[PDB]
Amino acid sequence: TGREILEKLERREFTREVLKEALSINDRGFNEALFKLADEIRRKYVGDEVHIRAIIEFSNVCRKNCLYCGLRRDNKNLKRYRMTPEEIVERARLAVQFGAKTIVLQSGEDPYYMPDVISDIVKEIKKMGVAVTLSLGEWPREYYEKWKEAGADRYLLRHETANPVLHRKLRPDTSFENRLNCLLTLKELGYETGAGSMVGLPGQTIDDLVDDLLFLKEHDFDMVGIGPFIPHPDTPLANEKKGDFTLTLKMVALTRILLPDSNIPATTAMGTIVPGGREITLRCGANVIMPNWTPSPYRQLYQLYPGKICVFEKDTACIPCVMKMIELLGRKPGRDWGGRKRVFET
Numbered sequence: 001t002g003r004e005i006l007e008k009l010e011r012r013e014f015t016r017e018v019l020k021e022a023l024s025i026n027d028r029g030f031n032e033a034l035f036k037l038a039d040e041i042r043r044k045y046v047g048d049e050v051h052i053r054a055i056i057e058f059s060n061v062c063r064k065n066c067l068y069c070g071l072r073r074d075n076k077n078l079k080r081y082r083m084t085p086e087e088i089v090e091r092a093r094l095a096v097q098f099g100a101k102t103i104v105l106q107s108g109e110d111p112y113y114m115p116d117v118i119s120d121i122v123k124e125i126k127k128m129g130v131a132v133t134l135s136l137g138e139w140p141r142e143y144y145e146k147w148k149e150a151g152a153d154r155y156l157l158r159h160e161t162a163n164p165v166l167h168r169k170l171r172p173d174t175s176f177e178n179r180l181n182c183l184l185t186l187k188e189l190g191y192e193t194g195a196g197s198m199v200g201l202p203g204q205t206i207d208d209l210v211d212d213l214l215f216l217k218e219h220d221f222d223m224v225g226i227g228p229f230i231p232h233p234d235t236p237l238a239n240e241k242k243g244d245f246t247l248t249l250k251m252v253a254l255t256r257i258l259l260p261d262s263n264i265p266a267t268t269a270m271g272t273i274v275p276g277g278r279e280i281t282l283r284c285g286a287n288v289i290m291p292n293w294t295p296s297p298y299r300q301l302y303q304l305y306p307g308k309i310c311v312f313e314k315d316t317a318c319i320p321c322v323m324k325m326i327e328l329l330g331r332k333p334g335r336d337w338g339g340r341k342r343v344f345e346t
């Protein structure tokens, strides 16, 4: 029964059997109770602060060919861009002037910057007294070491799917084994490390989602980024179905329940598939948001998926907008860098 599954989640009996049933039950009452549980666990462990991570998507050049992604190298219907290191540093400075306590640098897997230009950029931003999070994909250990020495604090590297067969199909340049080895190296080097997956990929099952949750629990990641798959018209997956918002929201809720002290963003993909999706997600376990800080005229060219919200807004709009969002949600802005605050338990 739904009531029995909630009782087991409340007692932290996180068996495969319990997680599968939670994801399989579609009862509105059960779902609402699950979201309430996750919301309460979030409030108890990580409080009411919503941590703002200002994201600068500094290049849409990519060497990889992921089947879901609009930046895949085979996509010729996309104007490619690269911000200069001076542009990136000064754009980061502007975010810090607007109150950002974490700068996130994200790109396609663009060889041009790697590793030294990134190191130089990271060193300049670290002078501003903020946390730096990188999201640059898969690189050699030596690059990750150099970036950590340069001052990088965190690394976001979504594991995408924990099914190694699906992973290899969707990401033909690499493997789940590679992705996991990247994540383990990041952890070893002392990064606060973020993983997470997409929900509703072509061929992905409920059992795969259960494996995603068990994988996250196993490795105790500091951050978990979860969003729905959104098909992009300039990719091989163009005609496939979008991920379901409510199922994806259940994955966020379960992630909070399993990893109560983790940092969990309300992802832009959630706000893209449903108007107000990020706000809902912030009320179902999430405690982080990433306002878009990519400048014009490049913001519109960073199209991992279509319809992406905030593309049409003035450059500087998203930090003020999320501060208003945080207030109308009855939440507080983060006071410090919002690093993980571990609660050791049993």
Ligand SMILES: Nc1ncnc2c1ncn2[C@@H]1O[C@H](CSCC[C@H](N)C(=O)O)[C@@H](O)[C@H]1O
Residues within 6 Å of the ligand: 068, 069, 070, 106, 107, 108, 109, 135, 136, 137, 138, 156, 157, 158, 160, 197, 198, 227, 228, 229, 230, 231, 232, 269, 304, 305
């Ligand atoms: N079509 C799509 N729908 C939803 N999310 C997508 C998507 N395409 C890509 N993403 C998500 O966007 C994230 C950032 S991709 C940018 C960073 C780096 N190149 C990397 O691959 O890690 C990915 O991890 C993926 O989960």
Ligand code: SF4
Residues within 6 Å of the ligand: 062, 063, 064, 065, 066, 069, 070, 071, 072, 073, 107, 108, 109, 137
């Ligand atoms: S998901 Fe990352 S690595 Fe894959 S094509 Fe997109 S930008 Fe490149």
Ligand code: FES
Residues within 6 Å of the ligand: 291, 292, 309, 310, 313, 317, 318, 319, 321, 322
């Ligand atoms: S956060 Fe982009 S304008 Fe609302």
Ligand SMILES: [Cl-]
Residues within 6 Å of the ligand: 156, 224, 225, 226, 265, 267
């Ligand atoms: Cl994320």
Ligand SMILES: [Cl-]
Residues within 6 Å of the ligand: 227, 267, 268, 269, 270
């Ligand atoms: Cl996103």
